Design a protein around this motif. Structure first.
Motif, PDB file in Angstrom:
ATOM      1  N   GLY A  84       1.058  -1.096  -0.093  1.00 40.98           N
ATOM      2  CA  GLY A  84      -0.001   0.003  -0.093  1.00 40.98           C
ATOM      3  C   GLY A  84       0.913   1.285  -0.067  1.00 40.98           C
ATOM      4  O   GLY A  84       0.514   2.199   0.486  1.00 40.98           O
ATOM      5  N   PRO A 182      -7.580   1.191  -5.427  1.00 38.34           N
ATOM      6  CA  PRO A 182      -8.087   1.346  -4.150  1.00 38.34           C
ATOM      7  C   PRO A 182      -7.735   0.494  -2.756  1.00 38.34           C
ATOM      8  O   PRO A 182      -7.019  -0.243  -2.958  1.00 38.34           O
ATOM      9  CB  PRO A 182      -9.668   0.934  -4.384  1.00 38.34           C
ATOM     10  CG  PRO A 182      -9.569  -0.145  -5.465  1.00 38.34           C
ATOM     11  CD  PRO A 182      -8.364   0.301  -6.180  1.00 38.34           C
ATOM     12  N   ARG A 183      -8.314   0.867  -1.855  1.00 48.91           N
ATOM     13  CA  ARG A 183      -8.013  -0.018  -0.573  1.00 48.91           C
ATOM     14  C   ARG A 183      -8.452  -1.209  -0.778  1.00 48.91           C
ATOM     15  O   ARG A 183      -9.635  -1.480  -1.523  1.00 48.91           O
ATOM     16  CB  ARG A 183      -8.640   0.666   0.671  1.00 48.91           C
ATOM     17  CG  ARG A 183      -9.115  -0.287   1.649  1.00 48.91           C
ATOM     18  CD  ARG A 183      -9.798   0.513   2.872  1.00 48.91           C
ATOM     19  NE  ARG A 183      -9.165   1.549   3.641  1.00 48.91           N
ATOM     20  CZ  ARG A 183      -7.980   1.509   4.083  1.00 48.91           C
ATOM     21  NH1 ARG A 183      -7.412   0.381   4.310  1.00 48.91           N
ATOM     22  NH2 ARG A 183      -7.404   2.480   4.625  1.00 48.91           N
ATOM     23  N   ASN A 184      -7.792  -2.358  -0.274  1.00 42.49           N
ATOM     24  CA  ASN A 184      -8.184  -3.652  -0.512  1.00 42.49           C
ATOM     25  C   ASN A 184      -8.402  -3.992  -1.831  1.00 42.49           C
ATOM     26  O   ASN A 184      -9.020  -5.043  -2.103  1.00 42.49           O
ATOM     27  CB  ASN A 184      -9.571  -3.869   0.294  1.00 42.49           C
ATOM     28  CG  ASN A 184      -9.391  -3.623   1.905  1.00 42.49           C
ATOM     29  OD1 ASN A 184     -10.078  -2.953   2.328  1.00 42.49           O
ATOM     30  ND2 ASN A 184      -8.380  -4.129   2.255  1.00 42.49           N
ATOM     31  N   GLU A 191      -3.940  -8.279  -1.445  1.00 41.93           N
ATOM     32  CA  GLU A 191      -4.866  -7.299  -1.350  1.00 41.93           C
ATOM     33  C   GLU A 191      -4.121  -5.953  -0.569  1.00 41.93           C
ATOM     34  O   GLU A 191      -3.424  -6.242  -0.032  1.00 41.93           O
ATOM     35  CB  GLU A 191      -5.799  -7.943  -0.373  1.00 41.93           C
ATOM     36  N   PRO A 193      -3.050  -3.056   1.569  1.00 40.71           N
ATOM     37  CA  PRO A 193      -3.545  -2.200   2.621  1.00 40.71           C
ATOM     38  C   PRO A 193      -4.114  -0.882   2.403  1.00 40.71           C
ATOM     39  O   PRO A 193      -5.095  -0.912   3.086  1.00 40.71           O
ATOM     40  CB  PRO A 193      -1.864  -2.061   3.251  1.00 40.71           C
ATOM     41  CG  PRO A 193      -0.974  -3.182   2.559  1.00 40.71           C
ATOM     42  CD  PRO A 193      -1.643  -3.460   1.273  1.00 40.71           C
ATOM     43  N   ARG A 194      -3.557  -0.193   1.901  1.00 39.34           N
ATOM     44  CA  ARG A 194      -3.865   1.311   1.679  1.00 39.34           C
ATOM     45  C   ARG A 194      -4.361   1.538   0.044  1.00 39.34           C
ATOM     46  O   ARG A 194      -3.704   0.663  -0.925  1.00 39.34           O
ATOM     47  CB  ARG A 194      -3.057   2.223   2.072  1.00 39.34           C
ATOM     48  CG  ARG A 194      -2.716   2.160   3.756  1.00 39.34           C
ATOM     49  CD  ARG A 194      -3.842   2.897   4.534  1.00 39.34           C
ATOM     50  NE  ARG A 194      -3.369   2.855   6.023  1.00 39.34           N
ATOM     51  CZ  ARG A 194      -3.885   1.760   6.979  1.00 39.34           C
ATOM     52  NH1 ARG A 194      -4.659   1.030   6.524  1.00 39.34           N
ATOM     53  NH2 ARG A 194      -3.546   2.162   8.202  1.00 39.34           N
ATOM     54  N   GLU A 195      -4.979   2.396  -0.184  1.00 40.33           N
ATOM     55  CA  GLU A 195      -5.211   3.095  -1.413  1.00 40.33           C
ATOM     56  C   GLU A 195      -3.837   3.740  -1.774  1.00 40.33           C
ATOM     57  O   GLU A 195      -3.202   4.538  -1.085  1.00 40.33           O
ATOM     58  CB  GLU A 195      -6.249   4.030  -1.473  1.00 40.33           C
ATOM     59  CG  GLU A 195      -6.088   5.284  -2.327  1.00 40.33           C
ATOM     60  CD  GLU A 195      -7.224   6.161  -2.350  1.00 40.33           C
ATOM     61  OE1 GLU A 195      -8.431   5.758  -2.467  1.00 40.33           O
ATOM     62  OE2 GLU A 195      -7.047   7.469  -2.567  1.00 40.33           O
ATOM     63  N   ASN A 196      -3.374   3.385  -2.993  1.00 44.51           N
ATOM     64  CA  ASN A 196      -2.130   4.337  -3.318  1.00 44.51           C
ATOM     65  C   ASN A 196      -1.836   4.016  -5.087  1.00 44.51           C
ATOM     66  O   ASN A 196      -2.757   3.741  -5.608  1.00 44.51           O
ATOM     67  CB  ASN A 196      -0.981   3.633  -2.610  1.00 44.51           C
ATOM     68  CG  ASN A 196      -0.064   4.774  -2.222  1.00 44.51           C
ATOM     69  OD1 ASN A 196       0.340   5.656  -2.995  1.00 44.51           O
ATOM     70  ND2 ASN A 196       0.351   4.566  -0.829  1.00 44.51           N
TER      71      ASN A 196
END
Length: 450
Positions: A84, A182-184, A191, A193-196
């Protein structure tokens, strides 16, 4: 408690009256195209399969130094996804660039610290800008806003300022491909961790701080048409390639100094420690510097105050007194007149110059930041009024109480030694070039207020 909403409203009205007085801002050096792609699971999986899941997964555990192959591109994406965490690498293969161009994008935006401030200062605020554009292709030009945005050209050696859209065709597209998730977000068996996002920079110009020939040979004639300058783009330079460009920047800074043109730098995070130290030494030529908590810590760190750097970034929100010790350290070593610290919940300025206009400029820049975060862009100056409705955040109020007790800030203003210390709590939307919008808006509006 302080009536911050009243102060924010007055600051906006004052800058709206005063911003028109600025005659021109010189903006150099980094301009590019940003191409944003919103990653989709099935497409990303199929593309990993086509090129070999095996190799891709290898590069997800350890980033390449640069992207030479398609497995390196996809694996670098995957690295950001499962951490993430944001990363950026140069894409140095023509085959990979072609691969990326064909894969395409969903949204096209102006990129680069020069490009985004040209659009903000010039297009939104209506201040004439003279912009350095390494490669002004038709696509690059199409992304500038309307307004007094100029690039210099020379006819019979005569300087002519023209809008980007009137510049000659022929130059190439410098595209940074921004792969967003996106997140997840899920892919294969990971999957996020964070949106990035991961950025593949298909850009032979800005990573080396390319400087157009006319800005090397005619810089003084160009600079004479400006009143302020904002310098940007030093951060990617490395020990290998820093020589010539730092020498150019130093010569340009000396000319600006000879001409009386005050210069600002946002001290973007600079991974190469030798170059970071060189930028510190360049600061002697700057009137103003902006930075956030990571940047300030990075600078204090390379200077050998590792314990102080840890404190600057240790608390969320940053222990303000540690921050101030770092600002006081920097301002005495460099001789800059102005340092604007900006972080999530609050801003601080430490200035030789005194008065409410320092505060009003910070408040204005916080409104601009909040409007940009909410709308995504800013189209008109008076739209910044929308930031008035954004609540001030808890962290800002918490830091105010500390600074009220330890300095004796009233309405965000106090004095230490021969500096004014100025504080504001930010209006937080929390939803880019936000850091540059902040420190360019404060710098230019403070000058317009004086």
């Amino acid at each position: 408690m302080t009536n911050w909403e009243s102060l924010y409203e007055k600051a906006l009205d004052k800058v709206e009256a005063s911003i028109r007085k600025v005659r021109g801002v010189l903006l150099a050096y980094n301009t590019n195209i940003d191409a944003i792609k919103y990653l989709k699971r099935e497409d990303l999986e199929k593309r990993i399969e086509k090129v070999g899941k095996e190799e891709v997964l290898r590069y997800s555990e350890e980033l390449p130094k640069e992207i030479e192959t398609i497995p390196q591109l996809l694996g670098s994406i995957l690295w950001s996804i499962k951490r993430g965490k944001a990363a950026e690498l140069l894409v140095v293969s023509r085959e990979v660039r072609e691969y990326m161009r064909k894969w395409g994008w969903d949204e096209l935006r102006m990129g680069g610290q020069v490009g985004i401030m040209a659009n903000l200062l010039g297009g939104v605020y209506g201040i004439p800008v003279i912009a350095h554009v390494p490669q002004l292709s038709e696509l690059q030009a199409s992304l500038f806003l309307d307004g007094p945005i100029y690039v210099p050209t020379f006819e019979r050696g005569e300087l002519r300022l023209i809008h980007p859209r009137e510049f000659r065709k022929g130059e190439e597209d410098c595209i940074h491909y921004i792969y967003e998730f996106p997140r997840n977000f899920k892919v294969l068996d990971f999957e996020a961790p964070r949106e990035n996002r991961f950025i593949g920079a298909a850009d032979d110009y800005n990573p080396i701080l390319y400087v157009r020939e006319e800005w090397i040979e005619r810089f003084e004639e160009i600079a004479k048409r400006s009143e302020l300058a904002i310098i940007s783009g030093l951060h990617p330079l490395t020990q290998e390639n820093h020589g010539k460009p730092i020498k150019l920047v130093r010569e340009h800074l000396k000319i600006l100094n000879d001409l009386g043109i005050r210069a600002h730098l946002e001290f973007a995070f600079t991974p190469d420690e030798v170059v970071r130290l060189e930028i510190v030494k360049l600061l002697k030529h700057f009137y103003s510097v902006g930075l956030n908590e990571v940047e300030l810590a990075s600078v204090v760190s390379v200077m050998g105050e590792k314990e102080l750097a840890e404190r600057i970034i240790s608390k969320d929100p940053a222990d303000p007194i540690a921050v101030i010790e770092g600002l006081l350290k920097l301002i005495k070593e460099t001789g800059v007149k102005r340092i604007h610290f900006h972080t999530y919940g609050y801003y601080l300025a430490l200035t030789r110059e005194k008065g409410e206009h320092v505060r009003d400029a910070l408040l204005f820049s916080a409104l601009a930041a909040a409007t940009k975060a909410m709308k995504g862009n800013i189209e008109k100056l008076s739209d910044i009024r929308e930031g008035l409705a954004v609540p001030i955040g808890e962290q800002g109020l918490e830091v105010e109480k500390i600074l009220e007790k330890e300095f004796s800030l009233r309405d965000g203003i106090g004095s230490i030694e021969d500096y004014q210390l100025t504080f504001i709590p930010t209006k937080v939307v929390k939803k880019v070039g936000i850091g540059d919008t902040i420190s360019s808006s404060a710098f230019v509006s403070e000058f317009s207020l004086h």
